Every structure is written in structure tokens, then in C-alpha cells.
Design a protein around this ligand. Sequence first.
Ligand SMILES: CC(C)(C)OC(=O)N[C@@H](Cc1ccccc1)[C@@H](O)CN[C@@H](Cc1ccccc1)C(=O)N[C@@H](CCC(=O)O)C(=O)N[C@@H](Cc1ccccc1)C(N)=O
Lengths: 99, 99
Amino acid sequence: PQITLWQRPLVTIKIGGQLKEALLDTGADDTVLEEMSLPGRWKPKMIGGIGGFIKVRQYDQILIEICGHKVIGTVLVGPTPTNVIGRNLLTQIGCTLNF
Amino acid sequence: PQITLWQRPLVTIKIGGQLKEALLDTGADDTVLEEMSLPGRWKPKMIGGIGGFIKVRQYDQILIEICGHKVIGTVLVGPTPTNVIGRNLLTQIGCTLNF
Ligand SMILES: CC(C)(C)OC(=O)N[C@@H](Cc1ccccc1)[C@@H](O)CN[C@@H](Cc1ccccc1)C(=O)N[C@@H](CCC(=O)O)C(=O)N[C@@H](Cc1ccccc1)C(N)=O
């Protein structure tokens, strides 16, 4: 739908059988979730933002249901303060900015 | 206009007589710009993101022209790696997410 920015753009997502809330973030190249049990293989990675860099684990082809849409993509799991849905998934659900 | 997320959502902004590029970021409560000479009074502040926290200076009622729209709001200036336009200004230009 259409979502204004008067409040944080938080949505419900389903990933790995669990329900979580996540921030739709146009300024994030990647999707990064707070520490969680995810199954499968992975490679370590380092990502950066305002404040510096953190080490996360990268899982590829993970199924996530964002609002009503299912998408498969990479999800980084590590010490982020909040779950953020980045552009790698936002393009999959057809998300656009408008003004 | 309508902007997809296949690439970073970078726009041209004019602030303090200078031209700069900035990222439209729905996941940022605030607008934070790389170190720049801005005139006026300010209060120190600390902001956080993925990676930790940084110290910035806060200027209120600063005029910024984002794309074709003029807006007046708070702008944080400090050591951010890239200029980000946060929700405090995105609401001013009527920016919405859609999918
Ligand atoms: C700007 C500020 C007011 C301090 O708010 C946030 O940081 N907001 C974050 C959400 C949040 C707010 C408050 C509390 C908790 C959580 C989120 O929107 C962050 N958005 C961008 C802001 C930003 C972009 C670029 C530079 C500096 C800052 C970001 O860090 N995005 C990261 C997210 C992690 C990721 O996607 O990997 C990113 O795209 N990083 C890229 C590019 C990069 C590399 C190295 C350094 C900086 C940026 C990357 N591939 O690592």
C-alpha cells in the first residue's frame, strides 16, 4: 500500500517460522536482522553504517514474507539494533518512493 | 516523482549555497550531512545507527532544497560517511513508500 513517513515505516515479516517487526529502509543496501536462529550454510561478512562496522552472517535464498508478499533473497544476521529490510528485498516487493 | 529501488535513491540537494548529493533514507529519523560549513547556533548531539554512535551538531530551521522542493528543518552535521535525508525532511516533501 501507500505508507507515509510521519512515523517509522515498520512492517510485520515472517521468516523461519517466526514473526517479527522490521523497518522498511531505502537507505540500506542489505537486509539485516537482530540475532536469530536461521538454518542453513553461511559466510561471515562485515557491514557498515553510521557509527562504524559490524560482523554478520550471510544466508542466501531465505524465504521472507513481508506484509503479504513472499520473497527469497539474502539476509544478514548479526548485532544490528533493529531489523531493517533493505533494497535487495524492497525491489522484490515492488517498493517505490513517491513525492 | 516515482523512484524505484534498483539503485541507491540519491538526489541533489542545495543547502547553504552548496550543491550536494544525498540518500533518501526512510530508515533514518534524522537528516545527517558530512562535515560542512553551515552558519548559525547549535547544540551538540549524539546519534546512533548500525555500527554504534557518532557526535554531530544540530542546526534548526535550515533551508534545504531537495530536488525541486524547499523545506526548513533540523539538520545534523557530523562524521557520517554519506549525506542522508531522513524522515524529518521526507515528510516535508510529501514522500511516501508504495508497493
Ligand atoms: C541516520 C540516523 C538518524 C543515525 O539513523 C540510522 O542510522 N537509521 C538506521 C535505522 C535505525 C535508526 C534508529 C535506531 C535503529 C535503527 C538505518 O536507516 C540506516 N540507514 C543507512 C544510513 C547510512 C547509509 C550509508 C552510509 C551511512 C549511513 C545505513 O546505515 N545503511 C547500511 C545498512 C547495512 C547494510 O545494508 O549493509 C548500508 O547500506 N550499508 C552499506 C553501505 C555502507 C558501507 C560502509 C559504511 C556505510 C555504509 C553496506 N553495504 O555495508
